[PDB]
């Protein structure tokens, strides 16, 4: 409005240009959905700075005489968080609007609305409610289990189809329940759910003694996502809650449609996803989503005290920068890289007298056999994982046979294989969101060089 110096025509075009940024911000505040095209950084930072001004710690004429005033010692800390200091929620409700932080409260509502829009876009079009929690997937599963205790005070067991992952297994024990490990059935090369053993354990222990059935979608090959439809029917019949571990299944349309079809024909009370694995942000946050708004609110109000806004801000920045088209592009390129990674493993397996485990139901992880490797006591399988780690290859885990691990008092036989005696040792490789073609070409090149070193030795 300073037309005293600059000509009025040029100030009018600049002030009218600001209306274009306010148009994008208004559309987000009204519809609460992910924009199709990503915002420019100029629009995003203008939006973030305007939100932070609404927080009482950033008021020009504010005075504080309490114990939690959002004071910041280091200017580096304040700037790297865009001056969002008060966090999210209140002492009694993590979903409540914080009176001292209107901008942080609005940031939390918009983030959960953007996340809900992505969950529908990813495949679960029928999701009712969700919320971001600044805890990992393991601790977020624990929060679901802690909520179910007060609704099922006579239950002490959690029925859990086996998956060799320490975080989700410890969630059941951290919540104070006893996991009932259901071994998997070897159908071809795939380890799938044993529906007969699951329903048998329900009748042996009694439905009232079961806290919930804890299934899992995204997992390492040769394990595949659980039969969520049949497990949801069992949960609906015996009136047992169903909690789905969907750690990195948002990036997979097959995983999300499983959760959708399971809630369509049966019962799914909540499914939990990781922020870092599905949205390419730092580790630390998760999403608790469900189809019963009454129950999702119960989980949210079960959280004691305020919580960090840092994961919510990272997801807000990322989704607004990518847009719904930007996220869709990454979902399409992940399917392309999955086919490319599969074909490169097939070609490399033939040259070394190996094969690719046929796991068509796992759309993220692959497994190449390592049968023609260890000379019983040559330690070649263990050496391969160390040589790959030496040549700066991460994410390719090696699963040997006969491994035994004790996790929180429970001893697993055949650890990392999801079963007691898998036929052979294998090598894992996955196509996750954001993987470039250079990752596969460097992986194949360095894996080939590592295999030559063992064959030559
Ligand atoms: C990511 C992961 C988890 C939990 O990871 P956190 O360390 O809690 O963030 C649980 N189950 C599976 C299959 C996972 O991949």
Author numbering: 8 to 464
Copy the relevant paper text.
O-Phosphoseryl-tRNASec selenium transferase (SepSecS) catalyzes the terminal step of selenocysteine (Sec) synthesis in archaea and eukaryotes. PSTK first activates the hydroxyl leaving group of Ser by ATP-dependent phosphorylation, and then SepSecS exchanges the phosphoryl group for SeH in a reaction dependent on mono-selenophosphate and a pyridoxal phosphate (PLP) co-factor. Whereas SelA is a functional homodecamer that binds up to 10 tRNASec molecules, SepSecS is a tetramer. Despite possessing four equivalent tRNA-binding and active sites, SepSecS only acts on up to two tRNASec molecules at a time, leading to a half-sites occupancy.
Crystals of holo SepSecS diffracted to 2.25 Å, whereas the native and SeMet binary complex crystals diffracted to 2.32 and 2.07 Å resolution, respectively. Our 2.25-Å resolution structure of holo SepSecS possessed a phosphate ion bound to the P-loop in a distinct binding pocket as previously observed. In holo SepSecS, all four monomers are equivalent, possessing disordered catalytic P-loops and C-termini. Moreover, in the absence of tRNASec or large anions, the predominant conformation of P-loop residues (Ala103-Lys107) clashes with the placement of tRNASec in the catalytic protomer. Thus, positioning of tRNASec into the active site requires organization of the P-loop. Structural superimposition of SepSecS tetramers derived from our structures yielded RMSD values within ∼0.4 Å, establishing that human SepSecS adopted the same quaternary structure in all crystal forms.
